[PDB]
Structure formats: structure tokens, C-alpha cells
Design a protein around this ligand. Structure first.
Ligand SMILES: COC1CCN(c2nccc(Nc3cc4c(ccn4C4CCCC4)cn3)n2)CC1
Length: 288
């Protein structure tokens, strides 16, 4: 696009390269995603231009030209993954964790109210600024393109935040899949280690089962009829959350437990999570 001066490469996304760029006319600084490209995808993505919220990265423009799709986003200076890594020695202070979770739930509540799911939440698509805001990036792209096994650069797309219903082969995802992912990220902020760092679909599932118990018809009606469910799955006992996310307090453990319910019908909604007692003393700290 003749209107954009590339400043520097930001990274490699799932679908294409991302550059920091400047608009040659307006001087606006943006994040420019270049995807090597489907008419249904364009329709779907174009409708995301109206899905505006303070905790969703703004989609400024969608430019389809010469069999390439450019997505022009607001620029944020850092992702949560880098912040977590830089905070590895001391950890992210609880009040900032709480603020971030609160804001992310607001973002989800908004998108879910418009029946738009993310489906591939991970620390790398959560973006932060120096004023204490956090925003969800790439919302809606999974419905338009699918979530592939490998990225455009052949990198493995992480399974760590994937909900069990997806792993077990359900074709119809609900908004609950995003609550699962956010619960995994919450736990990761608190403990400074990924909750379920699976390196294959079955390793991912068995890591979930080892912590939360192997699901059965008691806790998840219909689970044994799911496409990829096998009666031969080992039967692991459920662990206490006290062991899973120390030293998180009882309000946080309660919220996390409800975000990781097996049955997507039982899993807490973003709206209901915002009303949880964990947020009674929520503040908006500024990060290091
Ligand atoms: C997977 O590669 C990651 C590399 C590190 N990250 C990053 N570091 C600095 C600034 C920034 N700014 C930024 C990134 C943005 C947007 C809108 C979308 N993205 C990325 C997020 C996931 C892939 C597209 C706005 N600012 N992002 C996220 C992308």
C-alpha cells in the first residue's frame, strides 16, 4: 500500500507478518498486518470494523488489493507475553493481574454480546500500553480464516489455551471457549508458568485431565459421546486448586474454578465473571 511507510517488523502472526507503519498522509502510526490472500472472509472481517470497544484493538481499515489482504490496526507498544517474561523474577503484582483480567472480561463481554468469538486467545494477542490498559487483538479472525495447525511461517499454533470441547472434536464452539482460554492465561499470570503446556492434542487433553480430573457424565453430560472421546482415556483424580494456583486467594481460586468448568454450559460467562467478588477491590495500576 502506497500510503504506508514501514517502520519496523513487529512479528509474525498466525496468518501474516505484522509491521509498525506510518500513514504517509495522516502521519498516523499503525500496526499493519499483511496476509497472503476468499469473499466470505472479506465480508466477515469488514464487519469487525464496527466491533469497537476500549478493550478491543481497533481495526482501522481492511484493504484487499493484488491478492493480499492488509489489516490496519491501532498500534500498541507491547504484548502480554513479553511483559510476563520481563516480570519473571518478581511476578506481575496481583492488583495489575486483577485489572488486566477485569479489562479482558469487559472485552469478551462486549464481543460475546454481538455473538463474535475470538477462539484463539493467547498472551501474544493481548496488547498493553503504559497507562494500564490491555486489549484483545485478532478478534474475529478465526471465524473468517479458521485456526490452522501451523502459521504462515510453519510455526506451531499453540494448544495451551484450547478448551476441552475443541480438543474433543465438537464442531460448534460457544463463547465459553474464550472464557477457558482467559482462565488459563489468568493462571499463567499468577504462577509465572503455563497451566497446561501441551505439545500435542492428546498431551494437551491429558494435562487438563491430570489437573481437573478426567471428565465423565457426572460433571459433563454428553462428554462420552463427543467425536474424539475414547473410553480408554486414563482416569485421573481431580487436584485441589490450592495446589494449582498458589498463592492466589479464595476469591481468585473460585473465579478460576468457574472459568475452567468442563461443561461449557456451566462455565461462567464474561458478564457473570465481571460481577464476581474477586473484582470488589479492582483498581487500575500502571505497569512497569
Ligand atoms: C506474534 O507476534 C507478536 C510479536 C510481539 N507483539 C507485539 N509486540 C510489540 C508491539 C505489538 N504491537 C501491536 C501488535 C498487533 C496489533 C494488532 C494486532 N497485532 C498482532 C497481535 C497478534 C498478531 C497481530 C497492534 N499492535 N505487538 C504481538 C505480535
Amino acid at each position: 500500500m502506497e500510503n504506508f511507510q514501514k517502520v519496523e517488523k513487529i512479528g509474525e502472526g498466525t496468518y501474516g507478518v505484522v509491521y509498525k507503519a506510518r500513514n504517509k498522509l495522516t502521519g498516523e502510526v499503525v500496526a499493519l498486518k499483511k496476509i497472503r490472500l476468499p469473499s466470505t472472509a472479506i465480508r466477515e472481517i469488514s464487519l469487525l470494523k464496527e466491533l469497537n470497544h476500549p478493550n478491543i484493538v481497533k481495526l482501522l481499515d481492511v484493504i484487499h488489493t493484488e491478492n493480499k489482504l492488509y489489516l490496519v490496526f491501532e498500534f500498541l507498544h507491547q504484548d502480554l507475553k513479553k511483559f510476563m517474561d520481563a516480570s519473571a523474577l518478581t511476578g506481575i503484582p496481583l492488583p495489575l493481574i486483577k485489572s488486566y483480567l477485569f479489562q479482558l472480561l469487559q472485552g469478551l463481554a462486549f464481543c460475546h454480546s454481538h455473538r463474535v468469538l475470538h477462539r484463539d486467545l493467547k498472551p501474544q494477542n493481548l496488547l498493553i500500553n503504559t497507562e494500564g490498559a490491555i486489549k484483545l487483538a485478532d478478534f474475529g479472525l478465526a471465524r473468517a480464516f479458521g485456526v490452522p495447525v501451523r502459521t504462515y511461517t510453519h510455526e506451531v499454533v499453540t494448544l495451551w489455551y484450547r478448551a476441552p470441547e475443541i480438543l474433543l472434536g465438537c464442531k460448534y464452539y460457544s463463547t465459553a471457549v474464550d472464557i477457558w482460554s482467559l482462565g488459563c492465561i489468568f493462571a499463567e499470570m499468577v504462577t509465572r508458568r503455563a497451566l497446561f503446556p501441551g505439545d500435542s492434542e492428546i498431551d494437551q487433553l491429558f494435562r487438563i485431565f491430570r489437573t481437573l480430573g478426567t471428565p465423565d457424565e457426572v460433571v459433563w453430560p454428553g462428554v462420552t459421546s463427543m467425536p474424539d472421546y475414547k473410553p480408554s482415556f486414563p482416569k485421573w483424580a481431580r487436584q485441589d486448586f490450592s495446589k494449582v494456583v498458589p498463592p492466589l486467594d479464595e476469591d481468585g481460586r473460585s473465579l478460576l474454578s468457574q472459568m475452567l468448568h468442563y461443561d461449557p454450559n456451566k462455565r461462567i460467562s464474561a458478564k457473570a465473571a465481571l460481577a464476581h467478588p474477586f473484582f470488589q477491590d479492582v483498581t487500575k495500576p500502571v505497569p512497569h
